[PDB]
Design an enzyme around this catalytic site. Structure first.
Site, PDB file in Angstrom:
ATOM      1  N   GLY A   1      -2.379  15.492 -20.898  1.00  0.00           N
ATOM      2  CA  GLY A   1      -1.419  15.277 -22.005  1.00  0.00           C
ATOM      3  C   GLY A   1      -1.350  13.857 -22.416  1.00  0.00           C
ATOM      4  O   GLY A   1      -2.431  13.195 -22.464  1.00  0.00           O
ATOM      5  N   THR A   2      -0.155  13.259 -22.671  1.00  0.00           N
ATOM      6  CA  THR A   2       0.157  11.849 -22.927  1.00  0.00           C
ATOM      7  C   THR A   2       1.470  11.716 -22.330  1.00  0.00           C
ATOM      8  O   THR A   2       2.171  12.640 -22.027  1.00  0.00           O
ATOM      9  CB  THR A   2       0.242  11.413 -24.419  1.00  0.00           C
ATOM     10  OG1 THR A   2       0.694  12.478 -25.179  1.00  0.00           O
ATOM     11  CG2 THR A   2      -1.167  10.933 -24.811  1.00  0.00           C
ATOM     12  N   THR A   3       1.872  10.415 -21.904  1.00  0.00           N
ATOM     13  CA  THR A   3       3.082   9.951 -21.237  1.00  0.00           C
ATOM     14  C   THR A   3       4.223  10.357 -22.056  1.00  0.00           C
ATOM     15  O   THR A   3       4.209  10.243 -23.305  1.00  0.00           O
ATOM     16  CB  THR A   3       3.154   8.432 -21.036  1.00  0.00           C
ATOM     17  OG1 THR A   3       1.955   7.923 -20.444  1.00  0.00           O
ATOM     18  CG2 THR A   3       4.389   8.169 -20.126  1.00  0.00           C
TER      19      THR A   3
END
Lengths: 231, 249, 249, 242, 195, 242, 251, 244
Positions: free
Chosen positions: D28-30
């Site tokens: 995913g992303t943070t």
């Protein structure tokens, strides 16, 4: 059929492989380029003949008189989604007395991709659509994937040689954004875009199919000898 | 999506139905139980066994009441016994107690429960109940009767028979100890003796669950002054009255 | 035989090529069709089909591959004709539905696109609506017709759900050999009768039988006279006027 | 070989399907969620993966009702469906009781719906971790919901590729303030910990988006952080990393 | 309702149906039949409600002949009668009412006796030696009882039935323009053009 | 045949491979339970362990209140804990509706057993992966324990434990009732039975406790309550002073 | 159920349609031949097994309508489902359109019926092939159709299906001319009997004959008549063969 | 999924034949033997129980002989469990016909109705076929006495004399050797008994292992006496034929 199976599989790489496979539908399709300004959207589509006794295959479908879509990929797949976008737009005209905006329709579509990835006996659609329109919030250009991702861009492409169209559009990007109320200029820069995306099939005034949308102009599709002023 | 509508039951290539063989093997993994049909009653007996010895087995039962004439007892799977007893009761009430106002015959009840086992063999999404049941009851026209419904959905009438893992031994025993004249008393002293050869743990009336489909009781009816309504022929014997039969061998 | 693949237990599944596999298989069943040649002019569309026979017992004048959809739309079907029995019926219903609603002719393209919508419906149970086929059809059509707003048309309908307008198109076993020559000989200076004879001339080369009138069949669609199937005697006459022109090269 | 279906069990207690779905969320992303005393601050990293993109015109943070933010990572279309379901379930509550759905009550509806897809062979498990919380009248709350249909309370939660780094900085911040910090002050700290969580992933370039539901500044409705506040928060983080 | 009479002759059933048909206030047709041969040896005549009659009459020929061709043998008149009863019985309970009064007459060649049945609109089967429905029934039931004998030859059954026709004409306020006659017998199902 | 272990169907041997694996997924969390009968009370303790600091401890639970007099304490995974919790709450309410008095423990045990049975008999059904323990004080039966499990079987007890180390706990209860020669603890204060239970749990597991490593539930007559962390600590201070 | 039972095959077939054609080949042999004033369906009666009553065993030619008969070859279970569905249509035609069926409309109906169970999933294809014969109402065109389980119907001037059917078809090219059918019931009947005496053999036991003459005249011929024809074919054939043999000797 | 676990059970093999029918027929050849012999005065259906013990009750056993209607009884050989659904469907069908036409069912109708039920299971649904083989004894007006046997495909054929279940080929040859076209019930009983004495795995054929029923024109002029014999009347005809 190991991890590579039907729409239910993981797959130790977090993938599902059904998504990558339908994205080769697009690759096996003919090239299309979209680009927008703040006052006009323009799609410039390359049709593809099957033979010289065969015609050219329509690549741009009108959804509304301010909304249009153009496909890349499998034509039977396109026809299930194209019916869908026009159907919820007329629905939004009836119920809310309101045009169905481009950005919102991307969200509606998104969930329509999702549930045939959810359910066993489903498959993703093997068509990616480029969707332009002009609304009360202005021009939008959406790029829709077999994944179900909707993304907003200033100019994009999908097809074969899609990389070559985007590199032309990376140079000339800040030029076409400050051209506004002069639709002609945007049309020509997109002709020029799809020039770097030729398989030596040529620019031709019956191969190329244009459709535009303005602030000041409805959705209109140019075909045949309506494209000669650019070509 | 869903499409289990196709049976998990098939014919093996050498004849038979594969699953009912597997299920009969699962009946030889359970407890041991017997039933004797006397002239004047039926006695049924089973072993109370529990996972942990600190488990309460007195609050638990393995002889259940379907109707006041008709009791059941199992050898085989517990979970599968529990659900099939509640449906037995639901089909006896809907299909003979609304349609004729009264408790079914024992023969009519055996066929009602044998349809439920058949429709677990048939149809998709299922497997057989992995139990052998004894269906003991009394009806008013073929006298006392004892049946055994097998995992297949067949039933067979017997005069005395046994089930579970100690079945071969118990039946050899019942072959000489059954007789054409028998007293219910004599059948109680018999059933304990046989099932003692089948128990390898503790032996008490607290562990041997006895019920008799004997003769009517006006005290377990709860009311008086009707001679037309008869008492239940079933009578589960509390643990103390069973502790006596241990000596009365 | 027995192609190396990963699916033959699904039907709407992909495919490391990235195209539906079943659809792919369908187009390699159009080559077991009998050869139908079709020349589109600006003065009519001629549909010719080798009817195919396989015994001379076989009465072959009560069989045809030409089907009238309506007065102004013809179709010639090639491939597996049990599938096309269902497809043709569907279009006939639609055609009549448009004449009910609007008392007006149906577009040639509008009808052709509709039978494409039928062909996309293979499936186990997908999307919003029911799937009332399990497997795509294996028949491809040459829908000829005339509409008022684009004149004479000849379309090829694929069991894919995709359609291309052709100006001459061949389908069947001898499809490839016919179409090579179509690429070469066609011009937009043909008339109704020159096109007519051009069908029987190329249909003779992809003839695996003998060219006669009991195994070859013609049909036209003309604007003001409708779709008319040429009788068998008139087809005999043309075969003979071919032989005059074949000994005149 | 226990990946045939999502109803199968393995003898090591595993259910191979579902565990593989976590691999999907790690790409995913943070994304963080700050449980503050006054409310909650969500932030999502939005990658600019091309300069052809129109910045701040795509959201990955959508509200469900008006007082529950929901921010997701993993498969972005799949999360748009799990967010879509919880707008239906949320509105049903409001009709039936005339009160906006409580945050622990909403936790149960969503949890139960994700759990359901491992009890039937008809559907595929969702491959997302969704992070949701807001302010109700029994106070502010935060939940992190697993693709397994599991959840717990959190004093700070994280997901992404830079999740080692985020979860770590979030212990430091709960060790600065044992009594916790203002959501006013948290705008500037979400900015800070996404930036350290992108040193692993510094191939790309990104736009910071931040949102909040606080009782003190957005009056319990979930609104976006914007304007001068947004660009000051960006500037805060940048001075910290330099 | 109009003319529809049966008389059970020794060896045959003689049924007769009205020619006149009045729908609205104008006679529109006056040679129409109201009878449809079910099977080679069972005839069924009907009267009742308009338009209900024509449809429901076609319905029974269809179903009884469906079964005939299945078994390559024909149902007894007792068996066909019961089928017609069954259906109309479901129909007074059902949403749309049918209202069809039928005399089913047949020669059973397996009991070797002519059989005559009267099925009213409610759904009551009754075996009878003479019968009738409606308006006509009220004058004739008593007239046929008078002169009858148990065994009467075929041409005696015709003469009697023409006394009943003749009477009816005087007394009924309605006009019916004479009957059509059909004999159902052991030698087949024929008409007599003599009225 | 070839599938007996990814679908519910008998093996050659006559056993169900699928169901066994359900029982081999119950020791993942590694929670232990201990439950004892007072004379008028029922006491159950369960472990509460959080692995990291950033989980809020309050939301981490294993004692779930179904009915007003029946508590339900779950051993096995927290997703299938919530599906079991939900389901029982629905039946309990249903019972009150159609018979006019709040559902007995015994029947609530019998009901969840018949639902477990269906999940091991339907092809496309994933068995529950939980042992549920139902603690009550009845007015007709007094303090009672019934324990349900994935098989669909239930069994009654004097006292019981569950977890991976459960044998050690079996020893302490077996000794306790070997000395007394009665089938339950005889105490008149519901508090000291909580005290006795903890003492045996420290002895049995060989490990020291804290308020936060405990989670304590008590069913008296006509109410079910859970003790807060403050009230828990006090019991350990009165344990030392016994 | 709704799962596919037919899956398109990449060699341009469907596997299960080809399996169905084989199920008819291992079936019993039917020969059908149309004259110019009759249609004749001769069908084999399997009577290999002893102790069988034929009076209560149905015939393998069943009359659907009162002027349309249908014979069949292949699986005998499945055949009964197509025949009950086709009798229902025969009556329907009378109900809504009046007049009995024409041969063609029914023939198309049986073909679309076997066609439904390919194209639909959860229904597997049949394995039965029919000879559908009769005359249309108020005409005397003998019409002989054949339907097959692929879902295709053909007209034919004479046709055969079932076991060793190919051997019978070979006989019919030389002993039945397209242009001149036989012109009497009696001749057309001796032609189809001769065909049956080659691939079924074993006297007149197995031979069943239905003769239809125009306008609802269906009769099935008694054993005694068949016995006369069969014994005449063998004597006539013995007498012919032997004199040809002699003429050969000398020449 | 579902597709994954499906074998396909209703499809063909290259033989154009269905495994699940053959496999069913196999399993009938492991069960007890059943014989019907048609006399000019009746039909004898005589069936052997595949189980016996000296603790088996015989006096509430009708596990192969069942009345479908008062004029039609059957002898059952196959999966007894499967047969019980089909028997009660058969009783209900008999009654339906009897309800609407008010007249006793032909033997033809009733055998075909069942054959179509069985037919439905092979045709569609992905279900297994019920594995039962029936011998039907019936009287009806049209053809008089009638004997019919049907197999799991859904196909029936009428017979003069037949045997089903185990020893199908053996018992049949015996029947070809001693069959007189016309018989009395007494000649039918005599033949029936001796054949089952010649095919049993036990050293002698006993009454306690015999079920025996007839339908007799012992009552006359449109009336029939249906009999299910008690095992002690079976005992008595077993000494008449001199087995005992």
């Amino acid at each position: 059929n190991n991890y590579d199976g039907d729409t239910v599989t993981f797959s130790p790489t977090g993938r599902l492989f059904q998504v990558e496979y339908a994205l080769e539908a697009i690759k096996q399709g003919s090239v299309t380029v979209g680009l927008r300004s703040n006052t006009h959207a323009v799609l410039v589509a390359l049709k593809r003949n099957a033979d010289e006794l065969s015609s050219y295959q329509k690549k741009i479908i009108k959804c509304d008189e301010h909304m249009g879509l153009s496909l890349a990929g499998l034509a039977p797949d396109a026809r299930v989604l194209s019916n869908y976008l026009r159907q919820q737009c007329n629905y939004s005209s009836l119920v809310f007395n309101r045009k169905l905006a481009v950005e919102r329709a991307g969200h509606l579509l998104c969930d329509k991709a999702q549930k045939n990835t959810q359910s066993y006996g489903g498959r993703p659609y093997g068509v990616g659509l480029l969707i332009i329109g002009y609304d009360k919030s202005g021009a939008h250009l959406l790029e829709f994937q077999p994944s179900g991702n909707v993304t907003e861009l200033y100019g994009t492409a999908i097809g074969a040689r899609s990389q070559g169209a985007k590199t032309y559009l990376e140079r000339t990007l800040d030029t076409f954004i400050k051209i506004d109320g002069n639709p002609d200029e945007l049309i020509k820069a997109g002709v020029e875009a799809i020039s770097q995306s030729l398989r030596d099939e040529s620019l031709t005034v019956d191969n190329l199919s244009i459709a535009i949308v303005g602030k000041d102009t409805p959705f209109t599709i140019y075909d045949g000898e309506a494209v000669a002023k650019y070509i | 999506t869903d499409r289990y509508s196709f049976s998990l039951t098939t014919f093996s290539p050498s004849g038979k139905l594969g699953q009912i063989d597997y299920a009969l093997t699962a009946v030889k993994q359970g407890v041991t139980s017997l039933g004797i049909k006397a002239t004047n009653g039926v006695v049924i007996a089973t072993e109370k066994k529990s996972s942990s010895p600190l488990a309460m087995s007195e609050t638990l039962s393995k002889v259940s009441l379907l109707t006041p004439d008709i009791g059941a007892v199992y050898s085989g799977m517990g979970p599968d016994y529990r659900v099939l007893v509640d449906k037995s009761r639901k089909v006896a009430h809907t299909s003979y107690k609304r349609i004729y106002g009264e408790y079914p015959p024992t023969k009519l009840l055996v066929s009602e429960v044998a349809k439920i086992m058949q429709e677990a063999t048939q149809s998709g999404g299922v497997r057989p109940f992995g139990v052998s049941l004894l269906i003991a009851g009394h009806d008013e026209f073929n006298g006392f009767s004892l049946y055994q419904v097998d995992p297949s959905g067949s039933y067979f009438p017997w005069k005395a028979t046994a089930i579970g893992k100690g079945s071969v031994a118990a039946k050899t025993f019942l072959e000489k100890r059954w007789n054409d004249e028998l007293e219910l008393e004599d059948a109680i002293h018999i059933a304990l003796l046989t099932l003692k050869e089948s128990v390898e743990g503790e032996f008490n009336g607290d562990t041997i669950e006895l019920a008799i489909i004997g003769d009517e009781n006006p005290d377990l009816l709860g009311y008086t002054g009707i001679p037309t309504d008869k008492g239940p022929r079933f009578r589960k014997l509390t643990s103390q009255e069973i502790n006596d039969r241990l000596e009365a061998l | 035989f027995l192609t190396r693949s990963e699916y033959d237990r699904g039907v709407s599944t992909f495919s490391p090529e990235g195209r539906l596999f079943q659809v792919e298989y369908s187009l390699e069943a159009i080559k077991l069709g009998s050869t139908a040649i079709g020349i589109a002019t600006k003065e009519g569309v001629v549909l010719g089909v080798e009817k195919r026979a396989t015994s001379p017992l076989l009465e072959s004048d009560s069989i045809e591959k030409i089907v009238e959809i309506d007065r102004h739309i013809g179709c010639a079907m090639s491939g597996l004709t049990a599938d096309a029995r269902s497809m043709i019926e569907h279009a006939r219903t639609a055609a009549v539905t448009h004449n009910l609603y609007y008392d007006e002719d149906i577009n040639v393209e509008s009808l052709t696109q509709s039978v494409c919508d039928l062909a996309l419906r293979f499936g186990e149970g997908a999307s919003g609506e029911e799937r009332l086929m399990s497997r795509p059809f294996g028949v491809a059509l040459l829908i000829a017709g005339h509409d008022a707003d684009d004149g004479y048309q000849l379309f090829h309908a694929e069991p894919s759900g995709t359609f291309y307008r052709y100006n001459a198109k061949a389908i069947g076993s001898g499809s490839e050999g016919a179409q090579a020559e179509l690429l070469n000989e066609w011009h937009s200076s043909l008339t109704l009768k020159e096109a007519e004879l051009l069908v029987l001339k190329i249909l003779k080369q992809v003839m695996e039988e003998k060219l006669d009138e009991n195994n070859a069949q013609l049909s036209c669609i003309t604007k003001q006279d409708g779709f008319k199937i040429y009788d068998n005697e008139k087809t005999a006459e043309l075969i003979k006027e071919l032989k005059e022109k074949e000994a005149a090269e | 070989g226990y990946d045939l279906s999502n109803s199968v069990f393995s003898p090591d207690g595993r259910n191979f399907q579902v565990e593989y779905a976590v691999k999907a969320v790690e790409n995913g992303t943070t994304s963080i969620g700050i449980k503050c005393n006054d409310g909650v601050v969500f932030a999502v990293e939005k990658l600019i993966t091309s300069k052809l993109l129109v910045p701040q015109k795509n959201v990955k943070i959508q509200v469900v009702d008006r007082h529950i933010g929901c921010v997701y990572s993993g498969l972005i279309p799949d999360g748009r469906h799990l967010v879509n379901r919880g707008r239906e379930e949320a509105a049903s509550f409001k009709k039936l009781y005339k009160t906006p759905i409580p945050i622990p009550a909403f936790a149960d509806r969503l949890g139960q719906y994700v759990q359901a897809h491992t009890l039937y062979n008809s559907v595929r498990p969702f491959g997302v971790s969704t992070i949701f919380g807001g302010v109700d009248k029994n106070g502010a709350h935060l939940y992190m919901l697993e693709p397994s249909g599991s959840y717990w309370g959190y004093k700070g939660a994280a997901t992404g590729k830079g999740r080692q780094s985020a979860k770590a900085e979030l212990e430091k911040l709960v060790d600065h303030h044992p009594e916790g910090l203002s959501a006013r002050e948290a705008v500037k700290q979400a900015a800070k910990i996404i930036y350290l969580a992108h040193e692993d992933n510094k191939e790309k370039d990104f736009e910071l988006e931040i949102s909040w539901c606080s009782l003190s500044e957005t009056n319990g409705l979930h609104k976006f952080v914007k304007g001068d506040l947004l660009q000051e928060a960006i500037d805060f983080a940048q001075k910290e990393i330099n | 309702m109009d003319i529809i009479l049966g008389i059970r002759v020794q060896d045959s059933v003689i049924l007769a149906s009205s020619k006149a048909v009045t729908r609205g206030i104008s006679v529109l047709k006056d040679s129409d039949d109201k009878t449809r041969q079910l099977s080679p040896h069972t005839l069924m005549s009907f009267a009742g409600e308009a338009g209900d009659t024509v449809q429901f009459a076609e319905y029974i020929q269809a179903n009884i002949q469906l079964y005939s061709i299945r078994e390559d043998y024909e149902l007894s008149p007792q068996a066909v009668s019961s089928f017609v009863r069954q259906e109309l019985a479901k129909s007074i309970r059902s949403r749309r009412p049918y209202q069809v009064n039928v005399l089913i007459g047949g020669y059973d060649k397996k009991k070797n006796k002519p059989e005559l049945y009267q099925i009213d609109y409610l759904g009551t089967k009754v075996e009878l030696p003479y019968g009738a429905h409606g308006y006509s029934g009220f004058y004739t039931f008593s007239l046929l009882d008078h002169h009858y004998r148990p065994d009467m030859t075929t041409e005696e059954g015709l003469d009697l039935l023409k006394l009943c026709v003749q009477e009816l004409e005087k007394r009924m306020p309605m006009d019916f323009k004479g009957v059509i006659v059909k004999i159902v017998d052991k030698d087949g199902i024929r008409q007599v053009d003599d009225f | 045949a070839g599938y007996d272990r990814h679908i519910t169907i008998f093996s050659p041997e006559g056993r169900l491979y699928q169901v066994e694996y359900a029982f081999k997924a119950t020791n993942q969390t590694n929670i232990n339970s201990l439950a004892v009968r007072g004379k008028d009370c029922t006491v159950v303790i369960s472990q509460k362990k959080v692995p990291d600091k950033l989980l809020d401890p309050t939301t981490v639970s294993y004692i779930f209140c179904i009915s007003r007099t029946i508590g339900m304490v779950v051993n096995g995974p927290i997703p299938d804990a919530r599906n079991a919790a939900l389901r029982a709450k629905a039946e309990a309410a249903e019972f009150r509706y159609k018979y006019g008095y709040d559902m007995p423990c015994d029947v609530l045990a019998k009901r969840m057993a018949n639902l477990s049975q269906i999940y091991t008999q339907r092809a496309y059904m994933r068995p529950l992966g939980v042992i549920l323990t139902f603690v009550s004080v009845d007015e007709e039966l007094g303090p009672s324990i019934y324990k349900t499990d994935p098989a669909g079987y239930y069994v009654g007890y004097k006292a019981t434990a569950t977890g991976p180390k459960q044998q050690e706990i079996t020893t302490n209860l077996e000794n306790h009732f070997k000395k007394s020669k009665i089938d339950h603890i005889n105490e008149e204060s519901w508090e000291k039975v909580v005290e006795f239970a903890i003492t045996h749990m420290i002895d049995a597991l060989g490990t020291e406790f804290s308020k936060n490593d405990l989670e304590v539930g008590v069913a008296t007559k006509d109410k079910f309550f859970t003790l807060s962390a403050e009230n828990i600590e006090e019991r350990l201070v009165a344990i030392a002073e016994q | 159920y709704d799962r596919a039972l037919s899956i398109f095959s990449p060699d341009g077939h469907i596997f299960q349609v080809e399996y169905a054609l084989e199920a008819v080949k291992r079936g019993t042999c039917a020969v059908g031949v149309k004259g110019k004033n009759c249609v004749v369906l001769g069908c084999e009666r399997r009577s290999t097994l002893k102790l069988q009553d034929t009076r209560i065993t149905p015939s393998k030619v069943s009359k659907i309508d009162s002027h349309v008969v249908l014979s069949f070859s292949g699986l005998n279970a499945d055949s009964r489902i197509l025949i009950e569905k086709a009798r229902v249509e025969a009556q329907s035609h009378r109900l809504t359109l009046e007049d009995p069926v024409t041969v063609e409309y029914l023939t198309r109906y049986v073909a679309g019926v076997q066609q439904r169970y390919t194209q639909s999933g959860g229904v597997r294809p049949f394995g039965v092939s029919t000879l559908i014969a009769g005359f249309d109402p108020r005409d005397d065109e003998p019409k002989l159709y054949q339907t097959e389980p692929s879902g295709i119907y053909s007209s034919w001037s004479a046709q055969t299906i079932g076991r060793n059917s190919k051997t019978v078809r070979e006989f019919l090219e030389k002993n039945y001319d397209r242009k001149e059918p036989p012109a009497t019931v009696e001749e057309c009947v001796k032609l189809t009997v001769r065909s049956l005496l080659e691939v079924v053999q074993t006297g007149a036991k197995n031979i069943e004959i239905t003769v239809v003459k125009p306008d609802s005249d269906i009769v099935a011929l008694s054993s005694e008549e068949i016995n006369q024809y069969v014994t005449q074919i063998e004597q006539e054939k013995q007498e012919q063969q032997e004199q040809d043999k002699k003429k050969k000797s000398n020449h | 999924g579902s597709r994954r676990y499906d074998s396909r059970t209703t499809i063909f093999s290259p033989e154009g034949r269905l495994y699940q029918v053959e496999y069913a027929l196999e399993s009938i050849s492991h069960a007890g033997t059943a014989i019907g012999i048609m006399a000019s005065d009746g039909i004898v259906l005589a069936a052997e129980r595949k189980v016996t013990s000296t603790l088996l009750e015989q006096d509430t056993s009708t596990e192969k002989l069942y009345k479908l209607n008062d004029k039609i009884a059957v002898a059952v050989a196959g999966l007894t469990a499967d047969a019980e659904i089909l028997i009660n469907t058969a009783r209900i069908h008999a009654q339906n016909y009897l309800k609407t036409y008010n007249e006793d069912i032909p033997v033809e109708i009733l055998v075909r109705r069942l054959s179509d039920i069985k037919q439905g299971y092979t045709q569609h649904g992905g279900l297994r076929p019920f594995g039962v083989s029936f011998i039907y004894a019936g009287y009806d007006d049209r053809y008089g006495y009638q004997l019919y046997t049907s197999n799991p495909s859904g196909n029936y054929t009428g017979w003069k004399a037949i045997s089903v279940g185990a020893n199908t080929s053996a018992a049949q040859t015996l029947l070809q050797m001693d069959y007189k076209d016309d018989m009395k019930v007494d000649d039918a009983i005599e033949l029936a008994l001796k054949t089952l004495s010649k095919t049993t795995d036990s050293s002698a054929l006993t009454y306690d292992r015999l079920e025996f029923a007839t339908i007799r024109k012992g009552a006359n002029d449109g009336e029939v006496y249906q009999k299910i014999f008690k095992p002690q009347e079976i005992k008595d005809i077993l000494v008449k034929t001199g087995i005992t």
